[PDB]
Write a protein that binds this ligand. Structure first.
Ligand SMILES: OC[C@H]1O[C@H](O[C@H]2[C@H](O)[C@@H](O)[C@@H](O[C@H]3[C@H](O)[C@@H](O)[C@@H](O[C@H]4[C@H](O)[C@@H](O)[C@@H](O[C@H]5[C@H](O)[C@@H](O)[C@@H](O[C@H]6[C@H](O)[C@@H](O)[C@@H](O[C@H]7[C@H](O)[C@@H](O)[C@@H](O)O[C@@H]7CO)O[C@@H]6CO)O[C@@H]5CO)O[C@@H]4CO)O[C@@H]3CO)O[C@@H]2CO)[C@H](O)[C@@H](O)[C@@H]1O
Length: 213
């Protein structure tokens, strides 16, 4: 048994009839770890699984929940999220003997611009944090860039920043899935957003799309 290669979340906040099984992005270089930026309504109810149609709930004795976001997570069968908000839903699925051990973490919605367009910030600095929208269909909005170069964007977790980084590719959010050393152009030029002073990024994480203005 090795760690799972896929992970999905299903629940009321994605579709009121639980028809949407949202695939999670793999954390780069960390087998069995996954992340997804999701809006949870107040009292949302959900489960997750390693494959579509597999339901794992909060009762499962393989599951531990860590709240680092003030989400408020309880329940009998379904996970229940008390406080409405955007959260980074994070799953670590390790192997323990012949079974999985799952650690579910709720991180706060902290998205950052990194790199040359910020004048060289490669640190978590709230000057470069995106503004968070109030609603499920809203946009995260970056501060204005102050210099030219390739955009880098990421979520904040406990790991190195670039384990959970992403870009835009023809207007779609694309999560890093390779050993990116220096530039997105190592995958292709259409992955590299060239920013200039005054440009702004807008991201719609429910639709999976974004733009540079
Ligand atoms: O003191 C103990 C310390 O010693 C060693 O470290 C040495 C380095 O060996 C040496 O080169 C030099 O480092 C300088 C560097 O030369 C300067 O350029 C500058 O570095 C800046 C850099 O210029 C900035 O752009 C920014 O880097 C970003 C980077 O742009 C970005 O793409 C990303 O990079 C990570 C990448 O995405 C990952 O995939 C991975 O890449 C790995 C590959 O996975 C692996 O397979 C292999 O190929 O190595 C790749 C490169 O490591 O990791 C990348 C990060 O390492 O993120 C970075 C970081 O934000 O910022 C850096 C500064 O952080 O300054 C440094 C000096 O600070 O001098 C240092 C000694 O000071 C030893 O290697 C190190 O472990 C020890 O701690």
């Amino acid at each position: 048994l090795t760690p799972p290669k896929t992970m999905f979340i299903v629940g009321s906040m994605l579709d009121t009839d639980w028809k949407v099984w949202k695939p999670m992005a793999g954390v780069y270089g960390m087998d069995g770890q996954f992340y997804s930026m999701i809006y949870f309504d107040a009292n949302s109810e959900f489960k997750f699984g390693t494959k579509e149609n597999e339901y794992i709930g909060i009762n499962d004795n393989r599951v531990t929940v860590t709240d680092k976001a003030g989400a408020g997570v309880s329940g009998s069968d379904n996970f229940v999220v008390e406080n409405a908000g955007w959260y980074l839903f994070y799953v670590k699925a390790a192997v323990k003997g012949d079974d999985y051990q799952f650690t579910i973490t709720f991180y706060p919605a902290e998205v950052y611009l990194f790199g040359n367009t910020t004048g060289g910030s490669w640190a978590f600095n709230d000057e470069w944090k995106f503004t968070v929208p109030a609603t499920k269909d809203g946009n995260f909005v970056s501060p204005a860039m102050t210099a030219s170069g390739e955009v880098r964007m990421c979520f904040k977790t406990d790991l190195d920043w670039w384990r959970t980084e992403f870009t835009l590719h023809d207007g779609e959010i694309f999560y890093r899935d390779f050993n990116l050393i220096d530039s997105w152009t190592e995958k292709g030029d259409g992955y590299s957003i060239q920013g200039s002073a005054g440009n702004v990024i807008h991201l719609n994480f429910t639709a999976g799309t974004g733009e540079k203005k």
